[PDB]
Amino acid sequence: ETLGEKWKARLNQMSALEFYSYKKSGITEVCREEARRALKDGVATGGHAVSRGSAKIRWLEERGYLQPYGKVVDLGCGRGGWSYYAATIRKVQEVRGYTKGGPGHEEPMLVQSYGWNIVRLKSGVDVFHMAAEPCDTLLCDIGESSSSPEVEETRTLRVLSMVGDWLEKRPGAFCIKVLCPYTSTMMETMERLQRRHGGGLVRVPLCRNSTHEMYWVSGAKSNIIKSVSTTSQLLLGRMDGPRRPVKYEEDVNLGSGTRAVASCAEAPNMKIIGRRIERIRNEHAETWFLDENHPYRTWAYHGSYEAPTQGSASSLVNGVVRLLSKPWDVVTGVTGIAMTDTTPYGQQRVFKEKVDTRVPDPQEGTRQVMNIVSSWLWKELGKRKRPRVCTKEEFINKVRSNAALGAIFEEEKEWKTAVEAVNDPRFWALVDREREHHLRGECHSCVYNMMGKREKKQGEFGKAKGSRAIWYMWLGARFLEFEALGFLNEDHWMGRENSGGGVEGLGLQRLGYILEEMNRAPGGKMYADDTAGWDTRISKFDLENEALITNQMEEGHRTLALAVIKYTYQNKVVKVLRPAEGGKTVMDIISRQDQRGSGQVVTYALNTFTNLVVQLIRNMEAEEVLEMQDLWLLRKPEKVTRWLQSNGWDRLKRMAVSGDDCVVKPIDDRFAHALRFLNDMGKVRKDTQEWKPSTGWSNWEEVPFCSHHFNKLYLKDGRSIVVPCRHQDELIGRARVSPGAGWSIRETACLAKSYAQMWQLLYFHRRDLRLMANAICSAVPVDWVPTGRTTWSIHGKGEWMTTEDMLMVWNRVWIEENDHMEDKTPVTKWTDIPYLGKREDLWCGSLIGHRPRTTWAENIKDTVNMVRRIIGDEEKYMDYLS
Ligand SMILES: Nc1ncnc2c1ncn2[C@@H]1O[C@H](CSCC[C@H](N)C(=O)O)[C@@H](O)[C@H]1O
Ligand SMILES: [Zn+2]
Ligand SMILES: [Zn+2]
């Protein structure tokens, strides 16, 4: 019927070798060999395009069919060639790519092409079930080819139904793949769409003769039927006569490194930070330079210098756990967990989206309600406790062997360990020198080392997840924090007795019993809302209100704590490695005024405080104590203090906050829509629309707190315990991951025993975990000492890192030392210790009943015997499986 429908008819009639010769006849191709190679090796600094797609967009660009600018959206990004190419264009500023990925579909590639810092690619996205957004440049390369034009037509029509909603937000530039432009209905539709939205159809010469696909580009203008049919003629012409040679063009070289970005970064108080910036620069004057292409938006940039790379993207498998957990070799929830990428590119790709942010200052009335509540809470906590200076001797007894040294300057680089440095008088001379500076209104050495935390986390793009920032100062600068504010931790100011709502010093054992009490109290549902990246959300004003403890100190102590807060918390100098162009690595010197650093001595103690103030303010807003106008100006501040004195403690004792983790049991469910103050303080809730009311729990046993949910379980005799539970896959997955590279079988086997024993103490109620832990304990030599880290948690008290009998250690934590356990009758055998209900166990990732597990259980005795030979026969083992 149409010139293209004719071409498709002919193409379908083609034989295998007719088609073969035809497909590339007189087409254009980019020379992709050099790119394929580097990509196989993983050379992100090559400037190589991730796909052919990059040249398909450079072609339209040079002709004037597309002039990308501003906010660029890549719908069906795949590897992201259109995305990475977009980021090189002088007028584009942000580039967000979205793709399906996973099985059978292409996943975003992580290259360091010029401007990679303005690219955010996302997988597991089905654009047909994604709401439109306003953008400046709209790109969409979706269209799976088919043998039937009936299938290609319905495939194109669905794609244009999708972009219609996007295009009515009027993007300035657009490029949409039109797979089937040649059918009557498709010509009819495209004319109607060209009328309504503009642009036109262009055929790319880089395309094979096997597709009639054209791109609906913003810079084109031509009758759609003239455009479609001139290209149909081309394709028909290429069928008849001899085969023409293919034309080869050199591929696009994007380049390498980050792009220069628009700054909204607050001005540095150089009178405070200047001496440290100038000291760093003098110890690095040979390499020190100012990078024009630094990627810092909200941080002040002070300079960079050539420095060696640190960290790795490597994850290893704990063969021991892997062999004893065969039914999970399938489960992607477990097999998908691995080490995080702590390399300079690994951390910086998270930094740019999560840490390089600037939260708008809260309003004056909000700023005041915060101040009233914070003064009240500091006065309440200090009622029974006195601030005090913590000592050198207190610190020595507290400092571990595994504690970071963090040496930044020449004079601090004298020791190889923290344990060695504290036993050196030359160290304490440095501490004394800095305190002298602090007392002279100066800071010379309190600079933060920032890097990626090596954690076990689920992956992204079939690759290791990027790493979260961890920032601590050097040992000496940390002691000065300790001596001024360490009283908060050491004298347990955030403990549940002193704070009512805190949980400092409690283990996962006890945490469940708190939420059980909390449920008995009348009121609404329980609300466990996560603040999306709490530390980054800590404002100028939050730090101001925190510094209100300073009033309860003696003038000298206040002076010391004030110099720490003002020069180290209110103002910060951060040292970070960043990947540069040419495969080089630079160390950057940046600074900021808001936010919390993870490695501050009183980070948990302050996050806890500020979170209680936040929760208290939400209860006032909910109970209608705070009004709509009270954000701008606090009308009648007396109403705040009256509420606090009447209900302050009663509401506090209805909370459980551990740093950034919280659970509030309000008076009613008005708390769910009490978001005005919440959002004004920048405490924006995680994975919810900024104004959609919060979702609460009617069942306390379902409430998430500290990565867990807690269950009341009753013994054989009848007594009860409130145990910690989480999804089994998170547990087996993390157990199956090995940190340290180049490990002897002992190092792996001993970390497998640590996981097994932790499971025996906290997760004994999970049927699979008790079995697998007994299997691990049976396959690993008995006299081998458990090693490594099983949790980074403050509530994971490491009672399982012992050679002692686990049934003895279990009785000690659940009976003997359990303050919620009246009867001290010890449990004599493990068969008395119950399991979670079969519905609950199965709800949290259990495989009871599934035949691959059922088989696994039956032959565990033999698979243990196998792992015994793997670790070595000649070793002494014991059977914990009978
Ligand atoms: N419903 C959908 N939602 C999102 N992406 C989809 C999709 N259907 C297909 N895709 C993806 O769209 C991509 C089309 S190919 C895009 C190529 C890209 N412009 C480049 O330069 O590499 C494929 O990777 C496919 O998996
Ligand atoms: Zn200092
Ligand atoms: Zn559970």
Author numbering: 6 to 887
The authors write:
The nonstructural protein 5 of Zika virus (ZIKV-NS5) is critical for ZIKV replication through the 5′-RNA capping and RNA polymerase activities present in its N-terminal methyltransferase (MTase) and C-terminal RNA-dependent RNA polymerase (RdRp) domains, respectively. The N-terminal MTase domain is responsible for 5′ capping and thereby stabilizes the viral RNA genome, while the C-terminal RdRp domain is critical for viral RNA replication. Both of these two domains are potential therapeutic targets for developing antiviral drugs. The RdRp and MTase domains in flaviviral NS5 proteins are reported to cross-talk with each other to synergize their RNA polymerase and 5′-capping functions.
Here, we report the first X-ray crystal structure of the full-length NS5 polymerase from ZIKV in complex with S-adenosylhomocysteine (SAH), with the hope of aiding efforts towards the identification of antiviral drugs to help mitigate current and future ZIKV epidemics. The crystal structure of the full-length ZIKV-NS5 protein has been determined at 3.05 Å resolution from a crystal belonging to space group P21212 and containing two protein molecules in the asymmetric unit. SAH is the demethylated form of S-adenosylmethionine (SAM), which is the major methyl donor for eukaryotic and prokaryotic methyltransferase enzymes. Co-purifications of SAH- or SAM-bound methyltransferase enzymes from bacterial expression hosts are quite common and have been reported previously for the DENV and ZIKV NS5 proteins. There are two zinc-binding sites in the RdRp domain. The MTase domain of the ZIKV-NS5 protein folds onto the RdRp domain in a manner similar to that observed in the JEV-NS5 structure. Unlike the JEV-NS5 structure, the linker region (residues 266–275) connecting the MTase and RdRp domains has continuous electron density to enable modeling of all of the residues. While the domain positioning of ZIKV-NS5 contrasts with those reported for DENV-NS5 structures, the individual domains in these proteins share similar structural features, as expected from the high sequence homology among the flaviviruses. The diffraction data in the current study offer insight into the larger structural features, but the interpretation of detailed atomic positions remains limited. Some strategies that are likely to improve diffraction quality include truncations of the currently disordered N-terminal (amino acids 1–5) and C-terminal (amino acids 888–903) residues of the protein to promote different crystal packing.
